[PDB]
């Protein structure tokens, strides 16, 4: 069974997610509006969407048990490299297989393959991204596993630039062990079949998605007129080599 610390960690991560993920998407009204007619007409809306999502990712990250014991530099490294990955992961909540799209409450805020294209990205990212979303959906994760996965994703010792790798590893292992134990104690067969390994694999998928996103973002942002359409937080986190 799950220890009291493990139950504690789960309760903390659930609450941290509830406080940083608004399932009514009510804040989407504050973003630059979506335009669907290239011009890259979806870049101002989606730039704001990602920018907003970074802030929420940070808010969640601060509440991860053990995260606060890291230096602020390492906090920075972990967030800079993981943010795109956790946005893709957390976006699974809005993703729907009915039509292979992210459904955020309304037609304006429903984003399909071509909306993402209209933000400067190609099928080289979008196709594996959608495939990720599908493979992830099909795990039918408990909300508890989802929040653990986002946490394990953030606290990853192999991230480039990490100083106190040992301490990051110890923090991850504690979450990892909470995940494995949660799966054995609270996820019934058959759904729990090789579930941990399938979740770790999704983190491997995210590393490729991350790399590909970095290449396309690099190319997108070099062009000063695209960079003009981004936010200052997106430039800071993803890069501003323009």
């Amino acid at each position: 069974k799950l220890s009291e610390e493990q139950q504690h960690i789960i309760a903390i991560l659930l609450d941290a997610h509830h406080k940083t993920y608004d399932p009514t998407y009510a804040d989407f009204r504050d973003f630059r509006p979506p335009v669907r007619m290239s011009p890259l007409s979806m870049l101002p809306h989606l730039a704001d969407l990602v920018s907003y999502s970074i802030q929420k990712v940070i808010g969640f990250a601060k509440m991860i048990p053990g995260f606060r014991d890291l230096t602020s530099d390492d906090q920075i490294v972990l967030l800079k490299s993981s943010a795109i990955e956790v946005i893709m992961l957390r976006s699974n909540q809005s993703f729907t297989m009915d039509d292979m799209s992210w459904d955020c409450g309304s037609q304006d805020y429903k984003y399909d393959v071509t909306d993402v294209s209209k933000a400067g990205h190609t099928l080289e990212l979008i196709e594996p991204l959608i495939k990720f979303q599908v493979g992830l959906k099909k795990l039918n994760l408990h909300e508890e596993e989802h929040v653990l996965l986002m946490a394990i994703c953030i606290v990853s010792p192999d991230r480039p630039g990490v100083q106190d790798a040992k301490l990051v590893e110890a923090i991850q292992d504690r979450l990892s062990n909470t995940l494995q134990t949660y799966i054995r104690c609270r996820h019934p067969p058959p759904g729990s079949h090789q579930l941990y390994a399938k979740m770790i694999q999704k983190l491997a998928d995210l590393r490729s998605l991350n790399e590909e996103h970095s290449k396309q973002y690099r190319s997108l942002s070099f062009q000063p007129e695209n960079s003009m359409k981004l936010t200052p937080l997106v430039l800071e986190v993803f890069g501003n080599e323009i």
Partner: peptide, 11 residues
């Protein structure tokens, strides 16, 4: 380096 906004949001 220089990540003032990320830093601020962190504490």
């Amino acid at each position: 380096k220089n990540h003032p906004m990320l830093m601020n949001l962190l504490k």
